[PDB]
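Batch 3, record 17
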Amino acid sequence: FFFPVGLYLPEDRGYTTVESKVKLNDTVRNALPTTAYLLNRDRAVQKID
Amino acid sequence: FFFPVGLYLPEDRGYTTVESKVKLNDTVRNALPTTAYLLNRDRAVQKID
Amino acid sequence: PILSTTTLALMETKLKGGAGAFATSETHFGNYVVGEIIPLQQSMLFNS
Amino acid sequence: PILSTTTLALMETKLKGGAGAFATSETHFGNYVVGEIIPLQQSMLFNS
Amino acid sequence: LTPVTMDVNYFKIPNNPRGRASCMLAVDPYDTEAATKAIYDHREADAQT
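Prediction for the assembled complex:
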């Protein structure tokens, strides 16, 4: 398997398709993804920085 | 059984997933949780602080 | 883990919901629900 | 590809979703989910 | 008593309430030093988290 962490999506053409489902605080730490969340061998969450 | 009371969730990455389901009026007493709610052996509501 | 929540509003939301509502944890900005791991309270004690 | 997200809100949404939720990839403004190509973690390991 | 910043995701799945795993079926049988290292040694990563 392969998965990315830390990508910068093009901001000039930003878009959302889940605006009715999630809402985030207006912090730049939310705006810049710096972590990745995965599922363990059990369906439990794990994090990488 | 184990359960938490009084935790502080990180505001720098705060989020909501139930915005369309619930709304709280603006108040730091709502913003900072300090009690926990649970059910009896009957399905009545009980409170701890 | 046992069903618990920091706000009464999310408790009301769980009580109004259908079957299986007790199992799903979810969070508001600074409030959260923790869902029971087995359907004890919702069904297994009262269905008989 | 494996199920990965850049924010915890989208992971919570995936966990609250029904069957087939893990397979769909979707993006917020700066945040995104990559969907599982094989329904492995969601069903095939645990349906035994 | 727990720190205010304890991870909330810890409470969403079954776990050891002390904050570190000590299930002894993971340790080699009759290996006292390995078992005590798993339970108490905080310079070694906790199992399952």
